[PDB]
Amino acid sequence: YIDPKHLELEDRVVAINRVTKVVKGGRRLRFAALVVVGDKNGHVGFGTGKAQEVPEAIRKAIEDAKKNLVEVPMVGSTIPHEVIGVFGGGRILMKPAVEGSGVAAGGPVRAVLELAGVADITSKSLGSNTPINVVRATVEGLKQLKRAEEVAALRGKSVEEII
Template identity: 70%
Template sequence: MANRNDSRNNRRNKDDIEDQLVAINRVTKVVKGGQRMRFAALVIVGDKKGRVGFGTGKAQEVPEAIRKAVEAGKKNMIKVPKVGTTIPHEVIGHYGSGSIMIKPAPAGSGVAAGGAVRIVMDMAGIADVTSKSLGSNTPINVVRATIDGLKKLRTSEDVEKLRHAELD
């Protein structure tokens, strides 16, 4: 099912990296003369081939905050190991009081995840996965916990190299 906001929130850059907006937060600072408003943007960037990252940007205008978030996201991209269309094994990512449990799923099951986790998986190119959010459900904490979980993933070849042993 296509997201109705895809054309508005999903852009492709010249270096084949797409970005998708997760959340915009309006922050108000009360000063002597009234209120000063600024915006914070949370963006997920990825190439849908195994590389994904996130960035936050703050500015007085929304487009500027999004641009800053995209630049920050490109700087901290990670490589996600995949087995076919899913992940190699079950993993739990933590950040703050939030945890995300991510499990591999059979081919064709789709992404059974909500909100920010679904966007991270789509941007990473992972098509079949199940997830459960535990604890904090703030978008930034969920995204950071998901990225933490994806960083912990290892393929059987990686484990074999670490152990200096052969696996069948």
């Protein structure tokens, strides 16, 4: 839902692509932007925007992303279980990992996973490789992580009985 902004943030301009539009005469080019934001503790989001010049565009996109933030429940610096998230061609697979192993995941999804404060994880893109839909599918995947406590409360019994 609506998350405020009172914690530190981190930014990484993932990708930009000079985009044009034709009009009687020549062509006119804009520069979009694609930035995700996090605090490397378990809060992540991303945004976008476009402007005539690149610093302006990235400032816009930055200001955008800070209005979408997700939770990413973690346990011991690794996702709580296996998950699969799909959004319009974005197949993204994620599985837990061993301590101190290291993240093995493609570029665009690496930026998401890192800024969320993830230490050891594995993944594999499957299909789409657009720097946008991949990110959307990733975030959808993260939105699916269940949790021991949450399930303990949902189902009748209590945790350490759901083993």
